[PDB]
């Protein structure tokens, strides 16, 4: 089996299209199964965003919940997780209008 995959919503060769708007909530729904999996939200290109309060929140059953999203967050956000050496990555494409 493939069981051992960190990411719940399988696939990601095409990112999930997420509608968003500036000033409001942004949820990058790359929810893992097991609570304690190290997930790092990126954003093409080289700027990783790290959890904390509002400006980034990590939730195992939900995902990265960004309060007051900006244009800085418009585009391809990648969620990464290394499990037994293998680097799994799930993709999410945002936009407006």
């Amino acid at each position: 089996s493939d069981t051992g995959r960190p990411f719940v919503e399988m696939y990601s060769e095409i990112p999930e299209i997420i509608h968003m708007t500036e000033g409001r909530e942004l949820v990058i729904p790359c929810r893992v199964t097991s609570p304690n999996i190290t997930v790092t939200l990126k954003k093409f290109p080289l700027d990783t965003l790290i959890p904390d309060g509002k400006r980034i929140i990590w939730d195992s059953r939900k995902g990265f919940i960004i309060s007051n999203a900006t244009y800085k967050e418009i585009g391809l956000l990648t969620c990464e997780a290394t499990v037994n050496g293998h680097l799994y990555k799930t993709n999410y494409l945002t936009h407006r209008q």
Partner: protein
Amino acid sequence: HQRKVVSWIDVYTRATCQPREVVVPLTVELMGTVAKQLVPSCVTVQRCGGCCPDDGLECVPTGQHQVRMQILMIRYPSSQLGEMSLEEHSQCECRPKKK
């Protein structure tokens, strides 16, 4: 890696707002120089190309500098080298436009 058909993902990143090589004519300034010919007639610079994910957002430079590059000034008994400086971008960023 991801098809003879360039995969989506590989297509997006490739065509994303970054600094890239663009051919540019010789600068008004070294177009005035007293020289029989200027070699080469163009210089390639690094400039914020690609595109943003919106009509609203424009790909602009957050890091930049002037490149001094020597141009050949064929002239006289002997040709010599002259210095051409112009705008070149290193860091780029997709930012909101102006009205």
